[PDB]
Amino acid sequence: VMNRLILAMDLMNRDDALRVTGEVREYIDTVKIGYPLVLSEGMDIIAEFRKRFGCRIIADFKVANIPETNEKICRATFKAGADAIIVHGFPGADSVRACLNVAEEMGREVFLLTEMSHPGAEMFIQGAADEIARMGVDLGVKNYVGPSTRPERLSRLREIIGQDSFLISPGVGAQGGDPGETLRFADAIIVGRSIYLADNPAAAAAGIIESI
Amino acid sequence: VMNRLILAMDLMNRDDALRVTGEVREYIDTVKIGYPLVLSEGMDIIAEFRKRFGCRIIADFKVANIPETNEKICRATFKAGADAIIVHGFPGADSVRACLNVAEEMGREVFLLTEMSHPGAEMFIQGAADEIARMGVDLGVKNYVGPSTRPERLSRLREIIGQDSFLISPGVGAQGGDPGETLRFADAIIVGRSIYLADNPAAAAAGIIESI
Ligand SMILES: O=c1cnn([C@@H]2O[C@H](COP(=O)(O)O)[C@@H](O)[C@H]2O)c(=O)[nH]1
Ligand SMILES: O=c1cnn([C@@H]2O[C@H](COP(=O)(O)O)[C@@H](O)[C@H]2O)c(=O)[nH]1
Ligand SMILES: [Cl-]
Ligand SMILES: [Cl-]
């Protein structure tokens, strides 16, 4: 939310992750935490970040299992304090609905990943992306993830989900995406390495914000 | 959190509540919602505020029932999207523990109210307040509520809970409490009428912030 910039905190060491996140906190109030950090330091890192930085946490768990397993993963994730969870849409509607049901029970949110940003996404995901986005609309999904690396696809996704849906977008910086162009369609950009591997993370974040 | 100022949104009409909260959002990112608004507009107002303003929501429900009923109230409140719930400590440890158990299950927080700010608090609550605070410490409570109207009591409460516990304090402005003096002991101040009944809520909030 703050500055339309979400930090992707993929460092795998608690000390380095806490250092960088603290250094850029004045520029970002929303942190995306994924498996590189959680599998290395434990799920308790989510509540620690939430408390220490007063930031919202999106768990990038790319949930992609059968309904029953998806339900268990979402429950454990929200118990850990996550505000939202990112879920793949490719496994189908029943799998997404399972996540939505738990989010409803726990007062949390689901973000539906429709198209990925890397080269390999063109093989199978891109061809199903429009239909995955329409499925999200039909299921009542209001939060989506789309690719910074393909603004024409981000535009098409925005067209399907409408202006009221919230859209966040990774692939900015390291993967080649541009902050400003991405924000023509997405509500917020996700940035990882361009900030956390920088010699001065705060200066990198400030620079991105200034560019937009 | 933002500016150490929490808005107590006790207007009873959705339109007025949304107007004032939006007007002061640049100064406050945390809103306390209680029964005056919830009983008038419904529990869905919590998720609406959270989404529309991107603010944290503390549900001031003064939970004060037997354990079994407290569990049900906390579950419904967190399902509605609240980030935290304020609970009375006077009904005893089992009643507080029930709230803590649900907060743990749902990845949320409990704030323990130890002493109230109004005149009547001197009759029964004040005499039990130190023991209620010690009970909170023994139960692992890390968030507390104490009175702006009695800074000497707020100091005593801070002494019992320690410097690492988070303490918020209502009674600022309308009830007579002072922002700066209260912040000598509390981490954040709660302000309702001084802001929401002001001719210019944003100017009132800005003034409080400037005074501290
Ligand atoms: O299609 C997607 C979905 N998610 N992410 C994630 O967003 C972050 C982007 O990081 P980066 O800025 O370092 O490339 C990483 O956590 C990555 O797993 C992508 O990069 N692409
Ligand atoms: O001891 C307490 C506990 N809670 N509150 C609550 O905090 C808010 C303070 O509002 P005010 O600034 O308008 O007096 C109101 O919602 C009120 O119920 C108090 O005032 N005193
Ligand atoms: Cl990814
Ligand atoms: Cl009260």
From Swiss-Prot, chains A, B:
Active-site residues per Swiss-Prot or TrEMBL entry: K62
InterPro entries hit by this protein: Aldolase_TIM (IPR013785), OMPdecase (IPR014732), OMPdecase_arc (IPR047595), OMPdecase_AS (IPR018089), OMPdeCOase_dom (IPR001754), RibuloseP-bd_barrel (IPR011060)
Catalytic reaction annotation: orotidine 5'-phosphate + H(+) = UMP + CO2
Superkingdom, taxonomy of origin: Archaea
Annotated EC: 4.1.1.23
Binding site for substrate: 10, 32, 60-69, 117, 170-180, 192-193
Keywords: Decarboxylase, Lyase, Pyrimidine biosynthesis
Gene3D superfamilies: Aldolase class I
Pathway named in the protein's UniProt entry: Pyrimidine metabolism; UMP biosynthesis via de novo pathway; UMP from orotate: step 2/2
GO CC list: cytosol
Similarity comment text for this entry: Belongs to the OMP decarboxylase family. Type 1 subfamily.
PANTHER family assigned to the protein according to its UniProt record, in alphabetical order: OROTIDINE 5'-PHOSPHATE DECARBOXYLASE
Subunit structure: Homodimer.
Protein name: Orotidine 5'-phosphate decarboxylase
